Amino acid sequence: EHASRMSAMENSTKSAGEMLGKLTLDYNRKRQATITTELIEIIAGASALM
């Protein structure tokens, strides 16, 4: 039991590092898209006035 839990928790660290690595890239894409869309909104507001 102890030696199989030692391997199952290694598999869980591997899976929760893989999931975290994909979710970090997803967050970075969402962050980049967020600054881009907020900046495009500010430029579209300023180009209607200037």
């Binding site: 909104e41 579209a44 507001g45 209607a48 006035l49």
Partner: protein, 141 residues
């Protein structure tokens, strides 16, 4: 249909017709509220009336805001939904209850029009798409 009025500004109609159709339906429903009867008004797809208002104001060259909506898109739904009231006895005691509908995108409740109409209305009825596919119909969260 004996008790129902239907105000229908469809997708083929102009943007001011879809912008003005909740106000037309509220004015038709305020007759029962002001003459002592009790009214029920459903603004189905209020998030499409906001989109029609966005188009109508962007083509008037007014400056855009959050998701290119007008700045006064809160006032658009607040001055519409505040007309749903329960009057006093000296005004007849008539009532009008509103059921506005907002469509969200992928369950994002933090959208602009969604948060505005949540801050305007009294209650909320949330319908999740994961409760819908688990057999729970209506999918009340």
């Amino acid at each position: 249909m004996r008790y129902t009025i239907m105000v229908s500004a469809t997708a083929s109609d102009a943007a001011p017709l879809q912008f003005l159709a909740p106000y037309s339906g509220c004015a038709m429903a305020e007759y029962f509220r002001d003459t002592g009867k009790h009214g029920l008004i459903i603004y189905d797809d209020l998030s499409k009336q906001s989109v029609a208002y966005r188009q109508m104001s962007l083509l008037l060259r007014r400056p855009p805001g959050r998701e290119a909506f007008p700045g006064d898109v809160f006032y658009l739904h607040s001055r519409l939904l505040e007309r749903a009231a329960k009057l006093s006895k000296e005004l007849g005691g008539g009532s009008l209850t509103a059921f506005p509908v907002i469509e969200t995108q992928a369950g994002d409740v933090s959208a602009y029009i969604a948060t505005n109409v949540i801050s305007i209305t009294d209650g909320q009825i949330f319908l999740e798409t994961e409760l819908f596919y688990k057999g729970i119909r209506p999918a009340l969260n």
